[PDB]
Amino acid sequence: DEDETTALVCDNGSGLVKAGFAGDDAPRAVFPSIVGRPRHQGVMVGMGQKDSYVGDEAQSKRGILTLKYPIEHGIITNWDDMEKIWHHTFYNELRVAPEEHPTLLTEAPLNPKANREKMTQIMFETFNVPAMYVAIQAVLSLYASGRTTGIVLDSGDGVTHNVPIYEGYALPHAIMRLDLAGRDLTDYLMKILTERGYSFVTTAEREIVRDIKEKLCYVALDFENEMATAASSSSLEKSYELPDGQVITIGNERFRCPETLFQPSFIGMESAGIHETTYNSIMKCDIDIRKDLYANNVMSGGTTMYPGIADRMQKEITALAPSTMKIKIIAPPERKYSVWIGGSILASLSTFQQMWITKQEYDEAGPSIVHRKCF
């Protein structure tokens, strides 16, 4: 609180907002992106509740609330709800006066121009920021990495991409999309557990299943052989206590759930699994740069956090590639916050501080400015 200034790095996630100050090593505020007020709301004797805050309160308030994601699939679809999320971010989580900070916002891949313009309009008109930037989330991640060359497999919450990069450039024609990512894997685990006679269907039960997924699932060494071991499997049958206190047993569901990344037909997806899309992406590049891609396969995103994933990807890529090809899979430790960190590096870039968009630019060429000939 003086001269200088930082850069409000707000990564608008499909399920979680990550926000903080440029220059910090990780976001200081992480809260669910949802909207929820009592679904039954039966009055009582007073009030003192906040209608649709969701954020952190919701979670801990599981069972009372309803949820909505105004950013459900990564694109913002409800501007009144999004204004509530940004107000919460600035005033309740970070506890800042937004008019004192240049703010860098992230946007999903393929975000419409008109959507970026509405984001810009809200920042300047509603929150009175002195400036702002919009950054592409994949791009920020790439930034955080620091690798000019290599092929990234980025699997997050709602989408997975394979992005080959040569000298810093995402050759746009190589990238392929997959709908599936963590949101789909949590829904599939709810369904397969419901196969055993359990019942996980409510909003609260979804949260419970997301926790089982993140704590007990793993990727097999070989799907077929893991299924065969399931028979005499005395390991798989882990126990998990529900908040009600009942204890369920989870066995082959531990590896059947994430097997979907390699076999999208488990959820009905025709798409090619992540090892096939990696190969298909490398084959859309020049033959010449393929050796550099094969030796620099970088994993990113929350859904690449499973133990065993790098070894499995090494095995599968080795099976598809030429016999003399050197293959290397890199996974950065704390991948998931790779998107926020790239934003932090960019926003905290004094040297490129002219890329921030300003109140004068917005007034001159409206918000589009932050879209036409920059970010």
Ligand X SMILES: Nc1ncnc2c1ncn2[C@@H]1O[C@H](COP(=O)(O)OP(=O)(O)O)[C@@H](O)[C@H]1O
d(CA 249, CA 239): 5
What are the CA-CA distances from residue 74 to residues 120, 175, 281, 331 (Å)?
A: 17, 18, 23, 24
Tokens at residue 188, please? 């599939």
d(CA 85, CA 137): 18
Q: Which residues pair with 18 in a beta bridge?
A: 11, 30
Fill in the per-residue mask, 137 to 156: x = in contact with a second copy (CB under 8 A), - = not in contact: --x--xx----x--------
Closer CB to a second copy, residue 232 or residue 323?
Answer: 323
214 binds, among a second copy, ligand X, none (CB under 5 to 8 A by kind): ligand X
157 binds, among a second copy, ligand X, none (CB under 5 to 8 A by kind): ligand X
Of 209, 266, 206, nearest to 240 (Cα)? Answer: 209
Closer CB to a second copy, residue 2 or residue 241?
Answer: 241
Are the C-beta atoms of 107 and 12 separated by less than 8 Å?
yes
Q: Contact region for ligand X (CB under 6 A) — 151-159, 167-175, 223-231, 320-328?
A: 151-159
Pairing of strands 329-330, 297-300: parallel
Closer CB to ligand X, residue 206 or residue 210?
Answer: 210
Does 302 bind ligand X (CB under 6 A)? Our answer is: yes
Neighbours of 37 (CB within 10 A): 16
Q: Contact region for ligand X (CB under 6 A) — 113-121, 155-163, 220-228, 273-281?
A: 155-163
Does 112 bind a second copy (CB under 8 A)? Our answer is: yes
Does 157 bind ligand X (CB under 6 A)? Our answer is: yes
- Residue 351 CB, shortest distance to a second copy, in Å, is 9
Fill in the per-residue mask, 332 to 371: x = in contact with ligand X (CB under 6 A), - = not in contact: ----x--x--------------------------------
Hey, which residues between 9 and 48 contact ligand X (CB under 6 A)?
13-15
User: Count of residues binding ligand X (CB under 6 A)?
Assistant: 19
Are the C-beta atoms of 178 and 161 separated by less than 8 Å?
yes
319 binds, among a second copy, ligand X, none (CB under 5 to 8 A by kind): none
Closer CB to a second copy, residue 177 or residue 215?
Answer: 177
Can you tell me which residue has the tokens 């509740």?
Answer: 49
Q: Contact region for ligand X (CB under 6 A) — 45-53, 61-69, 180-188, 365-373?
A: 180-188
Closer CB to a second copy, residue 242 or residue 305?
Answer: 242
Are the C-beta atoms of 262 and 155 separated by less than 8 Å?
no
CB-side neighbour CA atoms (13 Å) of 124? 23
d(CA 113, CA 324): 45
What are the CA-CA distances from residue 316 to residues 136, 151, 223, 295, 311 (Å)?
A: 30, 15, 12, 14, 9
Does 291 bind a second copy (CB under 8 A)? Our answer is: yes
Torsion region of 220: left, alpha or beta (phi above 0 gives left; psi -120 to 50 gives alpha)? beta
Does 118 bind a second copy (CB under 8 A)? Our answer is: no
Of 268, 265, 255, nearest to 309 (Cα)? Answer: 255
302 binds, among a second copy, ligand X, none (CB under 5 to 8 A by kind): ligand X
- Residue 191 CB, shortest distance to ligand X, in Å, is 16
Residues that bind ligand X (CB under 6 A): 13-15, 156-159, 181-183, 210, 214, 301-303, 305-306, 336, 339
